[PDB]
Amino acid sequence: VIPPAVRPPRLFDYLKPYVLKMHFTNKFVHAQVIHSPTATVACAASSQEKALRETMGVTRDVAAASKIGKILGERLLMKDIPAVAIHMKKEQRYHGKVKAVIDSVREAGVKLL
Amino acid sequence: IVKKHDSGGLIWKRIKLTSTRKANAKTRLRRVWQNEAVLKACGTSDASVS
């Protein structure tokens, strides 16, 4: 079948302008928080960064995803962003690296919307 | 106008298109053509001081 175009969820009562999106490659893990009204990155954490690619041994596994999630949660609380909304792609489930990033963000003290 | 002339028992006679009827139609056409010319000339802009 022809795949339908993916739409953001429809607004019901409130805006919720901060959206968390995750990306994983063969070498690095990524996590971007997007400000939807301006299409700008409010906060981002990845193991490809110059300050982070040497402070951890493995930059591609589940442990790296957990570390990047904790770093992103601390950075989000530093920018006074109390809560984010989770966006999963077509192939992403609540398992493995996605689960590690989500659990580390929630454990850092950021509410999930 | 009634256009039923060859059916039924109620006679609606066919009004012949005479030259006098054509003259009246031409007069009505001249009136509507002058009205249309006035509307074309005046339709380019609106009057001010509203």
Partner: protein, 103 residues
Amino acid sequence: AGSTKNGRDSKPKNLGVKKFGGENVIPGNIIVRQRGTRFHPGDYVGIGKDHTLFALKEGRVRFEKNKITGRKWIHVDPKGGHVLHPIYTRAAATKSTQMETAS
């Protein structure tokens, strides 16, 4: 003797659009009464169990059409604009006021 076996029809249902594009709505106003999703719900539009579309916020009806598939959505553009989630107004907006009054 002749007899027709066709004499039935059903009562009218009065389906269709009640609020066209640009019309003002208040919460609870029915926008479309339909069978199935002839129009899909958009932002600030609810959908009922008989696929009735109703406004969730005060605002104006706006129609959207997908150019590729032909699917149509109906949105309400809210009168006072978007309202942030209360967790952002309690914390992020107070820090926003602090950042504004420090500037």
